[PDB]
């Protein structure tokens with residue numbers, strides 16, 4: 277039949293879809309003409325075109341929709357089982373549910389769904405865009421007690437090991453809870469050993485603004501204004517240097533952020 281018909285049949289004869297070249301060759305159409313037909317069929321809603329770099333990959337819209345379904349099932353499961361984690365490792369999601377797809381297509385697929393506002397792509401993890409943690413009452417209490425320990429500690433936060441012992445948790449478990457609290461903005465990571473209650477960090481910065489208001493300051497001066505040991509204050513200052521709140525000028529620091 278006509279090129280449109282021939283091409284449509286070819287696309288249907290490929291469950292996992294096929295790329296631009298394959299389609300053109302099989303339809304005996306030029307690359308240029310194949311693109312034009314693929315582009316129009318896409319605008320018609322009959323086909324879905326994944327833009328894999330400067331290459332094109334065609335799949336039946338029915339199949340594209342089924343793929344989205346495999347993702348929600350995969351994420352629904354991961355999210356319910358690991359409420360504290362941000363998402364499923366990109367690779368795990370790929371090998372477990374999209375092993376039949378070329379890696380490049382899988383990537384373009386995550387991109388499109390991300391651009392449509394369906395997924396949250398952070399680091400190398402994939403999460404449903406509207407992912408809402410569902411904790412058990414025991415998990416909720418631990419998050420509460422955990423946040424309170426840091427809140428009460430103010431500018432003398434307990435170390436990772438200390439908290440680990442107190443609540444008697446394994447390193448793996450505590451890191452997961454703390455990282456979740458960091459994402460919710462309850463805590464801020466100063467370094468691998470120290471996390472600070474966000475509100476406490478805000479007050480500490482105000483202390484630092486007041487300290488700096490009369491001239492550059494050294495570690496010893498920050499130590500006294502915060503009434504906290506250098507053990508907690510140096511890591512704080514290096515963290516503040518990093519987010520550009522403070523700035524080292526010589527052997528002292530000035531405040532260069534709000």
Ligand SMILES: [Y+2]
Pocket residue numbers: 327329384387
């Ligand atoms: Y892209």
Ligand SMILES: [Y+2]
Pocket residue numbers: 526527
């Ligand atoms: Y110096």
